[PDB]
Scaffold this motif. Structure first.
Motif, PDB file in Angstrom:
ATOM      1  N   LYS B   4       0.823  -1.204   0.000  1.00 34.32           N
ATOM      2  CA  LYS B   4       0.000   0.000   0.000  1.00 34.32           C
ATOM      3  C   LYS B   4       0.858   1.256   0.000  1.00 34.32           C
ATOM      4  O   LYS B   4       0.572   2.215  -0.730  1.00 34.32           O
ATOM      5  CB  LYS B   4      -0.933  -0.006   1.209  1.00 34.32           C
ATOM      6  N   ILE B   7       2.567   1.619  -3.459  1.00 35.93           N
ATOM      7  CA  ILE B   7       1.606   2.185  -4.398  1.00 35.93           C
ATOM      8  C   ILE B   7       1.404   3.667  -4.114  1.00 35.93           C
ATOM      9  O   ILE B   7       1.236   4.474  -5.037  1.00 35.93           O
ATOM     10  CB  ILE B   7       0.278   1.412  -4.338  1.00 35.93           C
ATOM     11  N   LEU B   8       1.410   4.050  -2.835  1.00 33.11           N
ATOM     12  CA  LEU B   8       1.296   5.461  -2.485  1.00 33.11           C
ATOM     13  C   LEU B   8       2.597   6.212  -2.748  1.00 33.11           C
ATOM     14  O   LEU B   8       2.577   7.321  -3.291  1.00 33.11           O
ATOM     15  CB  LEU B   8       0.883   5.605  -1.020  1.00 33.11           C
ATOM     16  N   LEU B  14       2.270   9.624  -6.650  1.00 34.74           N
ATOM     17  CA  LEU B  14       2.171  10.770  -5.751  1.00 34.74           C
ATOM     18  C   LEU B  14       1.853  12.052  -6.514  1.00 34.74           C
ATOM     19  O   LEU B  14       1.020  12.853  -6.073  1.00 34.74           O
ATOM     20  CB  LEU B  14       3.465  10.927  -4.955  1.00 34.74           C
ATOM     21  N   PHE B  17      -1.777  11.874  -7.694  1.00 34.76           N
ATOM     22  CA  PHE B  17      -2.663  12.090  -6.558  1.00 34.76           C
ATOM     23  C   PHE B  17      -2.697  13.557  -6.159  1.00 34.76           C
ATOM     24  O   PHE B  17      -3.766  14.093  -5.853  1.00 34.76           O
ATOM     25  CB  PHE B  17      -2.229  11.220  -5.375  1.00 34.76           C
ATOM     26  N   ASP B  18      -1.540  14.225  -6.166  1.00 33.07           N
ATOM     27  CA  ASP B  18      -1.498  15.643  -5.821  1.00 33.07           C
ATOM     28  C   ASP B  18      -2.296  16.476  -6.814  1.00 33.07           C
ATOM     29  O   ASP B  18      -3.098  17.335  -6.420  1.00 33.07           O
ATOM     30  CB  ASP B  18      -0.046  16.122  -5.759  1.00 33.07           C
ATOM     31  N   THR B  21      -6.077  15.646  -6.486  1.00 30.21           N
ATOM     32  CA  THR B  21      -6.612  16.174  -5.236  1.00 30.21           C
ATOM     33  C   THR B  21      -6.776  17.686  -5.296  1.00 30.21           C
ATOM     34  O   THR B  21      -7.812  18.213  -4.878  1.00 30.21           O
ATOM     35  CB  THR B  21      -5.704  15.784  -4.070  1.00 30.21           C
ATOM     36  N   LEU B  28     -14.670  21.327  -6.113  1.00 32.66           N
ATOM     37  CA  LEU B  28     -15.754  20.986  -5.201  1.00 32.66           C
ATOM     38  C   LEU B  28     -15.711  21.772  -3.894  1.00 32.66           C
ATOM     39  O   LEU B  28     -16.459  21.454  -2.964  1.00 32.66           O
ATOM     40  CB  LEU B  28     -15.735  19.485  -4.911  1.00 32.66           C
TER      41      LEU B  28
ATOM     42  N   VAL D   4       2.508  12.396  -1.410  1.00 29.71           N
ATOM     43  CA  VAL D   4       1.428  11.412  -1.408  1.00 29.71           C
ATOM     44  C   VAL D   4       0.544  11.588  -0.180  1.00 29.71           C
ATOM     45  O   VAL D   4      -0.689  11.569  -0.275  1.00 29.71           O
ATOM     46  CB  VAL D   4       2.003   9.987  -1.486  1.00 29.71           C
ATOM     47  N   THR D   7      -1.450  14.758  -0.589  1.00 31.66           N
ATOM     48  CA  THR D   7      -2.574  14.533  -1.491  1.00 31.66           C
ATOM     49  C   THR D   7      -3.689  13.753  -0.807  1.00 31.66           C
ATOM     50  O   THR D   7      -4.875  14.029  -1.029  1.00 31.66           O
ATOM     51  CB  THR D   7      -2.099  13.788  -2.735  1.00 31.66           C
ATOM     52  N   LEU D  11      -7.412  15.321  -0.520  1.00 34.32           N
ATOM     53  CA  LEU D  11      -8.612  14.701  -1.065  1.00 34.32           C
ATOM     54  C   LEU D  11      -9.406  13.924  -0.024  1.00 34.32           C
ATOM     55  O   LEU D  11     -10.465  13.385  -0.358  1.00 34.32           O
ATOM     56  CB  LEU D  11      -8.247  13.781  -2.232  1.00 34.32           C
ATOM     57  N   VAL D  22      -4.607   6.384  -1.967  1.00 36.55           N
ATOM     58  CA  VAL D  22      -3.558   6.357  -2.998  1.00 36.55           C
ATOM     59  C   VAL D  22      -3.406   4.892  -3.382  1.00 36.55           C
ATOM     60  O   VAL D  22      -2.465   4.195  -2.998  1.00 36.55           O
ATOM     61  CB  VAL D  22      -2.250   6.987  -2.509  1.00 36.55           C
ATOM     62  N   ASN D  24      -3.312   1.364  -5.829  1.00 40.72           N
ATOM     63  CA  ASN D  24      -2.601   0.896  -7.003  1.00 40.72           C
ATOM     64  C   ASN D  24      -3.569   0.762  -8.176  1.00 40.72           C
ATOM     65  O   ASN D  24      -4.779   0.965  -8.048  1.00 40.72           O
ATOM     66  CB  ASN D  24      -1.899  -0.427  -6.707  1.00 40.72           C
ATOM     67  N   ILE D  30      -5.495   1.079  -1.399  1.00 42.12           N
ATOM     68  CA  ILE D  30      -4.236   0.652  -0.800  1.00 42.12           C
ATOM     69  C   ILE D  30      -4.264   0.856   0.709  1.00 42.12           C
ATOM     70  O   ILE D  30      -4.184  -0.102   1.485  1.00 42.12           O
ATOM     71  CB  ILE D  30      -3.056   1.400  -1.444  1.00 42.12           C
ATOM     72  N   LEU D  88      -6.007   7.191  -7.673  1.00 43.07           N
ATOM     73  CA  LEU D  88      -6.142   8.283  -6.715  1.00 43.07           C
ATOM     74  C   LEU D  88      -7.623   8.530  -6.443  1.00 43.07           C
ATOM     75  O   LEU D  88      -8.378   8.882  -7.357  1.00 43.07           O
ATOM     76  CB  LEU D  88      -5.472   9.551  -7.242  1.00 43.07           C
ATOM     77  N   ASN D  93     -18.390  16.026  -2.111  1.00 40.04           N
ATOM     78  CA  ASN D  93     -19.660  16.585  -2.562  1.00 40.04           C
ATOM     79  C   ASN D  93     -19.445  18.003  -3.080  1.00 40.04           C
ATOM     80  O   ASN D  93     -19.041  18.876  -2.301  1.00 40.04           O
ATOM     81  CB  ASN D  93     -20.673  16.595  -1.431  1.00 40.04           C
ATOM     82  N   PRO D  94     -19.687  18.271  -4.367  1.00 40.17           N
ATOM     83  CA  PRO D  94     -19.439  19.625  -4.896  1.00 40.17           C
ATOM     84  C   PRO D  94     -20.306  20.707  -4.275  1.00 40.17           C
ATOM     85  O   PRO D  94     -19.863  21.858  -4.175  1.00 40.17           O
ATOM     86  CB  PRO D  94     -19.724  19.468  -6.395  1.00 40.17           C
TER      87      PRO D  94
END
Lengths: 96, 416, 48, 96
Positions: B4, B7-8, B14, B17-18, B21, B28, D4, D7, D11, D22, D24, D30, D88, D93-94
């Motif tokens: 995990k 993968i992160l 990364l 994801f950044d 996000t 939103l 990571v 992020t 999120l 994050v 795979n 993950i 990712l 909720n927007p």
């Protein structure tokens, strides 16, 4: 009819909209504004994605907001809105 | 967790994801039935759990909300008065959210169970003690309503009827504290229950030990607790150390300690010195660590008050109950003499214990007949603002000054 | 034995050991007898 | 290094964010610090929906690059995107 059509034309009144289509699982759209072969093909494609998303939801939670599920991808913000009787699939923009 | 993390902790993952996000973040980024906040949300007696197989001919002993999950009520029953053949005493539970009257684990006990509480350090089980010299542990995992294991009812453990017990120490290092009527301070190993991890024959006032009828400890201060007395000599019980025990014999009542909790309200003003106490002499007084005498008191009801355990947020509210069958929640910032939220139960039946929820969202009440009635305690009185906590602390300091001033006025105005 | 006996603590310990053993045996036998009675009822009510 | 985790915090603590994984490219989350089975089931459902979206895209034109799939559901309306390199998760909720 004209109320739903005016609502669709207002939601798609945003300039540069790819296409806002009231749709159906039957491979044809309830009210689309694109090329007819492309509209029917994308209606069938959205029907397939709609069935897969419905099965995915029922696998996750079978009592969720199962009336709309957009796809806000960079290409087209594909706002699928499958109603109970009709359906909608609005390939829209990421702006408005 | 290695896969995990990898993968992160991939650079491409990364970065993706950044970007996703940040993009998603930027994209939103009835009422009348709800109109009972100051007139009913602080006192909404709703959950009337009374298992007739247990509630009838039985009283309430104590209560608590489970720290692992406050959705339930970890409470025991008193001695079943009219059950010579049936079980001596067990523990019921009514879930706050789920509407299930049956307890998830009716740990029937051979003796008469003294008191009990849940424990989140090993959250699969519950713990308690008996009114004849036993402390037993039962778990919702097992399928036997009897005691899973029992403390050895010998000289090592609480020989006399120990009516108070608590699992001292969190999941970091738990050692179940026991205090006996014979004053056996016993921090017991929650895993190895053959003998307690500590065996301290607690005593005070030149080894003339008192009857510790109400144990209480400050929130997080595992090195010092507070013990009530039948003789009233509530002396501050140091918990950790060689000379640990009841030291400062602060006397803030004229009767046995009815029910006392550390007034550990949390906010801007840290009132850890103060500790709410209740007496057998209808004398609800506010003893404190510094205030050797009672700082302030309340003696409204004629009958003896049941117990006092204020909520852990607002120092203003002093959660208690009247012996004549009525609730007692006096908000200090609201009033100082009259009890503020003196709600009245149906039929005016007495109780021997009551408790706010572990979150303070509801203050339930026991019954002499055994009808466990749960009253919601909303944000009308339990929501402490930091200013409101500081305002209550300043009001407490002003009240201490006013008590000193009134004592001086009585001293200089007594005609002798 | 008697209360005046010098081995009162060992006698209490032995009584406690006997009580605990009897309680454990009673619980285990209750579970096993429930299992056996269930098996017998199932055999009597089973299909052919 | 901390990008990571930053992020994941972004999120997962956004405007009503349900939580960030994050994950795979296999779809399933993950980092699941609770009972992982719900995360894996919902993420497999979302991966099936994302493959359906890719199928619909290829029905329209397979050379379209996607930003996210704006799934709308009562549990966690996920604006996430399962990818061929990782996954990712951004469920928010927007309107909230």
């Amino acid at each position: 009819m004209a109320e739903v059509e005016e609502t669709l034309k207002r939601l798609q009144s945003q300039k540069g909209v790819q296409g806002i289509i009231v749709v159906n699982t039957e491979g044809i759209p309830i009210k689309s504004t694109m090329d007819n072969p492309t509209t029917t093909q994308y209606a069938s494609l959205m029907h397939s994605f709609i069935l897969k998303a419905r099965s995915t939801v029922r696998d996750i939670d079978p009592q969720n907001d199962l009336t709309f599920l957009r796809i806000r991808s960079k290409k087209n913000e594909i706002m699928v809105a499958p109603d109970k009787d009709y359906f909608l699939i609005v390939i829209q923009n990421p702006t408005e | 967790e290695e896969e995990k993390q990898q993968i992160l902790h991939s650079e491409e993952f990364l970065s993706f994801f950044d970007h996703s996000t940040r993009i998603v973040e930027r994209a939103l980024s009835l009422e009348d039935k709800e109109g009972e906040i100051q007139a009913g949300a602080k006192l909404s007696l709703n959950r009337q759990f009374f298992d007739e197989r247990w509630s009838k001919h039985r009283v309430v002993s104590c209560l608590d909300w489970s720290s692992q999950y406050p959705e339930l009520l970890v409470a025991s029953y008193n001695n079943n008065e009219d059950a010579p053949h049936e079980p001596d005493g067990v523990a019921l539970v009514w879930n706050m959210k789920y509407k299930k009257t049956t307890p998830e684990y009716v740990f029937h006990c051979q003796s008469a169970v003294m008191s009990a509480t849940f424990a989140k350090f090993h959250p699969n089980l519950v713990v308690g003690g008996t009114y004849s010299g036993q402390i037993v542990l039962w778990d919702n995992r097992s399928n036997k309503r009897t005691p899973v294991q029992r403390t050895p009812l010998s000289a090592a453990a609480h020989t006399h009827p120990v009516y108070c017990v608590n699992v001292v120490g969190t999941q970091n290092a738990h050692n179940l504290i026991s205090i006996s009527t014979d004053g056996k301070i016993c921090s017991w190993s929650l895993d190895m229950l053959s003998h307690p991890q500590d065996s301290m024959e607690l005593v005070h006032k030149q080894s003339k030990a008192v009857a510790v009828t109400s144990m209480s400890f400050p929130v997080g201060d595992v090195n010092n607790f507070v013990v009530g007395s039948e003789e009233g000599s509530v002396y501050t019980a140091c918990r950790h150390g060689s000379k640990a025990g009841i030291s400062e014999m602060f006397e803030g009542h004229q009767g046995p300690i009815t029910g006392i909790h550390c007034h550990a309200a949390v906010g801007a003003v840290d009132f850890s010195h103060l500790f709410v106490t209740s007496s057998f002499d209808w004398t609800v007084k506010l003893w404190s660590t510094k205030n050797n005498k009672p700082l302030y008191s309340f003696e409204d009801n004629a009958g003896y008050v049941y117990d006092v355990m204020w909520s852990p947020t607002h120092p203003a509210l002093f959660a208690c109950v009247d012996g004549m069958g009525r609730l007692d929640l006096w908000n200090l910032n609201n009033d100082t003499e009259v009890p503020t939220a003196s709600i009245s139960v149906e039929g005016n039946p007495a109780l021997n214990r009551v408790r706010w929820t572990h979150s303070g969202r509801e203050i339930a009440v026991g019954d002499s007949e055994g009808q466990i009635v749960i009253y919601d305690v909303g944000e009308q009185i339990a929501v402490p603002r930091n200013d409101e906590w500081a305002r209550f602390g300043r009001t407490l300091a002003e009240i201490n000054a006013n008590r000193a001033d009134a004592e001086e006025e009585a001293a200089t105005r007594i005609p002798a | 034995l008697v209360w005046e006996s010098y081995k009162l603590d060992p006698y209490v310990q032995r009584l406690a050991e006997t009580v605990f053993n009897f309680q454990e045996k009673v619980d285990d036998l209750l579970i096993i007898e429930e299992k056996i009675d269930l098996e017998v009822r199932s055999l009597e009510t089973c299909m052919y």
